[PDB]
């Protein structure tokens, strides 16, 4: 069948991927005792947008649930699925003649049927009429709460929908649960996004020089991903934190826009991942700007390498993700004590939540069509109200087919350190005279993307990770990627 | 005073630029009979957004009127200006402590006052109190219609604004009129955006090879602009049209995403422009993919070069922009006749609006903080209801300080050609025996950015333009060209 492809060495993604997702969704809905025979799933695609009140178009990127179900790149579409038969119908805009002048060929409905391998294609202005002629019992629409943003999913609507029986509660948990478990076809795309992003991270490590601005590496990363990988989008805004900025977790946004000069002696923490056909990657590499770890840098870095590999080595079905977070906390505390930053009983440190002073974020999260993917906190799964753990984006147990980031880190964050030093329950563990040397260090994060398998995990990411590997990579002479 | 700067060789933009815009706006309002003493201009900045219902942040780019007045890069701000004194107050978000962990340093109000060189800084939640203390007569807010998008500008609002007298009609046409006329400080930025984008177009012409995907050059262009120019954004989505795609005026959007393989014998039409600190550039270069113009390609290209230079040579204060559009039309028809594509009386061709078959868009538009800049159709200035001219984005007379694109083109667009051939009023001018050869040619557009001056124009763009210059650049030749 047909495939999405951007030519050259980019990945061919079969449209069968999306057909399988539609089938899986129907199979799950059919087993839900509340779903009536004759139900039709109705999803609304994203629409084109502009900057504010201007005519400056924003590059269109499809809404994630719609993409998961249909793989459609064009704005202004709807898509429906007959639950009982699995039959799919795509609705596309009926375009004006002048589209041919300004925007390009006015493709036929048959072109879109062939392109997307759906059962039928109709025009958007006929959706009420087409759905009426199918005599559905109920329209199943999308509405629920994203547990990372707190936003409510936008429910499909169209002129005449008021004439139908509509249910907006059943679908969201079911399509979310389907998205949590990646098919082998989806895993092929995530292997690819990790491959290109890994290559781009290596090019960045080879290119970094003292004196460069952080954003020069952002630019290079995105150029590699687009020109070589066909990744027009990144999965999230690139985080290119040098020096003390490596302690800022989502550095790089408009308010802190990757605009620091990299200096000799800095650590770099680069968290970047290209997106291909709306599938994510999310990789973080940490390394010395000048290509040689100092003793202090090596110690912090290898502490995080230890937790990274201990967590990956422990992951397998049935493992409770909060236990992995706590494992990483304990290892960090052990290593920081070995370094002399901490003293005392690590058991007592753990009881006082000291780990969260150094790693205030979650160990990792589901990844898929969104970088912070859906389904981390379905009904019955509660957020743990403790330092560190409360920032976990899931408290689920691991099962095969889940895709997770594994991203421990250690940071030296002044307001968290100052709080701890003021608290007698934590201050006694902290050796101020040693810690003072690490003020302004920034931080280290090592982020891998992995798939849970029947027996353990599959690592998708492939970047240098030991101190020796990293130093060798940065010292490499290869003119394998040289823009102008 | 302070400047915006992204280091390296990027442009230092004085914050005095925005202070002058505020002063100019106040001076204009003071002369306006509808404006009373004690008025305060109130603008609301853009807010951070995310993709649909996800927590995937969209990179924040400031709203254009707010940027013009304040130059503020952070989301969530408001800004007010006392009309009688010119005193400026910036309102910034009061951030949660956790911002320090995730987003970066929580800057003081004094930091922002120094950064932006405003008279006062306050937190956004205090805006009702602060304005109440000033006992304004009326708040002047922004509401009007953008004449390119048809959108209504977003008027500022805040909790408690209902307690004030608010006028939302006075400000819009006045701040639009200020934006139409660029200050010398603004011209410095537009010179720079044209310098970087011109350099990037030259790198693209050097790098293009038969067999590449169009998006490879989009990627390279944006990489040059960001890494060398500090341009994180483009001014609009890159149009990288090869072969037949060069006849599609806004090619490159999600529905036609620069995904064609460039073939031997193709023409390329690349319309790309980096944005620096929310100031636009907009440049189009046309050239043969294989670096050598054929006779047919040279003839079409030099026709557009002739109209480009005729218009630039005729532009000066007092010229009616629709007359320049008609001048380009007449030249295109003359040259198409000289090529044998058309025959008969050119006067008669013009009377039949035949020019619009080959150039269905406007000759050019205002450019500034938006690529299609504001103020083309103020009250009293009417759109001309004729082919081609109705697509003009302004029908004003030229005045010093205006910045316009000059972008004639000739395209071979099948549905427009076929319409003409079906029309007895137009059909006899076309020679099918020659025209058939140009079916699928695509098109040529030559786009310069210029400033209207007292004596004529200042050309901002600096790219190769003659056939000889273009062939030399594509063959790798350093500054082998002399601009107009
Ligand atoms: C904004 C976030 C996607 C940043 C980082 N990739 C974590 O997760
Ligand atoms: C989308 C538009 C900005 C495209 C082209 N630069 C014209 O104007
Ligand atoms: O937001 C999150 O969960 C992770 C933490 C570090 C950056 N991304
Ligand atoms: O939209 C416009 O007015 C011009 C026409 C060609 C591309 N940009
Ligand atoms: Mg990350
Ligand atoms: Mg992550
Ligand atoms: Mg243009
Ligand atoms: Mg233009
Ligand atoms: Na190197
Ligand atoms: O991350
Ligand atoms: O343009």
From Swiss-Prot, chains A, B:
Catalytic reaction list: Xaa-L-Pro dipeptide + H2O = an L-alpha-amino acid + L-proline
Instruction: Write the Enzyme Commission number(s) for this entry.
Output: 3.4.13.9
Checking Pfam families in the record gives: AMP_N (PF05195), Peptidase_M24 (PF00557)
> How is activity regulated here?
Specifically inhibited by the pseudodipeptide CQ31. Inhibition by CQ31 indirectly activates the CARD8 inflammasome: dipeptide accumulation following PEPD inactivation weaky inhibit dipeptidyl peptidases DDP8 and DPP9, relieving DPP8- and/or DPP9-mediated inhibition of CARD8.
As cofactor, the record names: Mn(2+)
Offer one example of a GO biological process linked to this entry. Answer: amino acid metabolic process
Q: Which residues participate in Mn(2+) 2 binding?
A: 282, 365, 407, 447
SMART domains listed in its UniProt record: AMP_N
Q: Identify the residues that bind Mn(2+) 1.
A: 271, 282, 447
The UniProt annotation places a dipeptide binding at 250, 282, 372, 393
GO MF terms here are: manganese ion binding; metalloaminopeptidase activity; metallocarboxypeptidase activity; peptidase activity; proline dipeptidase activity
- The keyword Transcription regulation is annotated on this UniProt entry: no
Give the CC-aspect GO terms.
extracellular exosome
Q: How is the cofactor bound?
A: Binds 2 manganese ions per subunit.
The answer to keyword Acetylation applying to this record is yes
User: Which of UniProt's keywords are assigned here?
Assistant: Acetylation, Collagen degradation, Dipeptidase, Disease variant, Hydrolase, Manganese, Metal-binding, Metalloprotease, Phosphoprotein, Protease
Q: Which residues carry this modification: Phosphoserine?
A: 162
Q: What does this protein do?
A: Dipeptidase that catalyzes the hydrolysis of dipeptides with a prolyl (Xaa-Pro) or hydroxyprolyl residue in the C-terminal position. The preferred dipeptide substrate is Gly-Pro, but other Xaa-Pro dipeptides, such as Ala-Pro, Met-Pro, Phe-Pro, Val-Pro and Leu-Pro, can be cleaved. Plays an important role in collagen metabolism because the high level of iminoacids in collagen.
User: Which family does this protein fall into?
Assistant: Belongs to the peptidase M24B family. Eukaryotic-type prolidase subfamily.
Q: Which disease is it linked to?
A: Prolidase deficiency: A multisystem disorder associated with massive iminodipeptiduria and lack of or reduced prolidase activity in erythrocytes, leukocytes, or cultured fibroblasts. Clinical features include skin ulcers, developmental delay, recurrent infections, and a characteristic facies.
According to the record's subunit comment, the protein's assembly and interactions are: Homodimer.
Any idea what this protein is called?
Xaa-Pro dipeptidase
């Amino acid at each position: 069948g047909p495939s999405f492809w951007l030519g050259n060495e980019t990945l061919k993604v079969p449209l069968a991927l999306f057909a399988l997702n539609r089938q899986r969704l129907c199979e799950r809905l059919r087993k839900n005792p509340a779903v009536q025979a004759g139900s039709i799933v109705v999803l609304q695609g994203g629409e084109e947008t502009q900057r504010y009140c201007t005519d400056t178009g924003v590059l269109f990127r499809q809404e994630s649930f719609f993409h998961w179900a249909f793989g459609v790149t064009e704005p202004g579409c709807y898509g429906v699925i007959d639950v009982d038969t699995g039959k799919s119908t795509l609705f596309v805009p009926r375009l004006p003649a002048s589209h041919a002048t300004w925007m390009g060929k006015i493709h036929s409905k048959e072109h879109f049927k062939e392109k997307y391998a759906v059962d039928d294609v109709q025009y958007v202005d006929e959706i009420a009429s087409v759905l009426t002629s199918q005599k559905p019992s109920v329209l199943l629409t999308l509405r629920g709460v994203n547990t990372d943003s707190g936003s409510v999913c936008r429910e499909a609507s169209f002129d005449g929908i008021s004439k139908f029986e509509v249910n907006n509660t059943i679908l969201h948990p079911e399509i979310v649960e389907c998205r949590v478990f990646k098919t082998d076809m989806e895993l092929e795309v995530l292997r690819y996004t990790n491959k290109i992003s890994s290559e781009a991270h290596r090019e960045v490590m080879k290119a970094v020089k003292v004196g460069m601005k952080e954003y020069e590496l952002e630019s290079l990363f995105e150029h590699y991903c687009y020109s070589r990988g066909g990744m027009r989008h990144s999965s999230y805004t690139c985080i290119c934190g040098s020096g003390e900025n490596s302690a800022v977790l989502h550095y790089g946004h408009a308010g802190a826009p990757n605009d620091r000069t990299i200096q000799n002696g800095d650590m770099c923490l680069f968290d970047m991942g290209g997106e291909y056909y709306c599938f994510a990657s999310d990789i973080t590499c940490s390394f010395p700007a000048n290509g040689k770890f100092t003793a202090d840098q090596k110690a912090v870095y290898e502490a995080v390498l230890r937790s990274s590999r201990a967590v990956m080595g422990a992951m397998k079905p049935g493992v409770w993700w909060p236990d992995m977070h706590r494992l990483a906390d304990r290892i960090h505390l052990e290593e920081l004590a070995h370094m002399g930053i901490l003293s005392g009983s690590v058991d007592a440190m753990v009881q006082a939540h000291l780990g969260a002073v150094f790693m205030p974020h979650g160990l990792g999260h589901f990844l898929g069509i969104d970088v912070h993917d859906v389904g981390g906190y379905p009904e019955g799964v509660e957020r743990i109200d403790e330092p560190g753990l409360r920032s976990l984006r899931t408290a689920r147990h691991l099962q095969p087919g889940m895709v997770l980031t594994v991203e421990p880190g250690i940071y030296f964050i002044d307001h968290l350190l100052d709080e701890a030093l003021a608290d007698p329950a934590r201050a006694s563990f902290l050796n101020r005279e040693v810690l003072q040397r690490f003020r302004g260090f920034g931080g280290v994060r090592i982020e891998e993307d992995v798939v849970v398998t029947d027996s353990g995990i599959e690592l998708l990411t492939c970047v240098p990770r030991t101190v020796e590997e990293i130093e060798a990579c940065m010292a490499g002479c290869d003119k394998a990627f040289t823009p102008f």
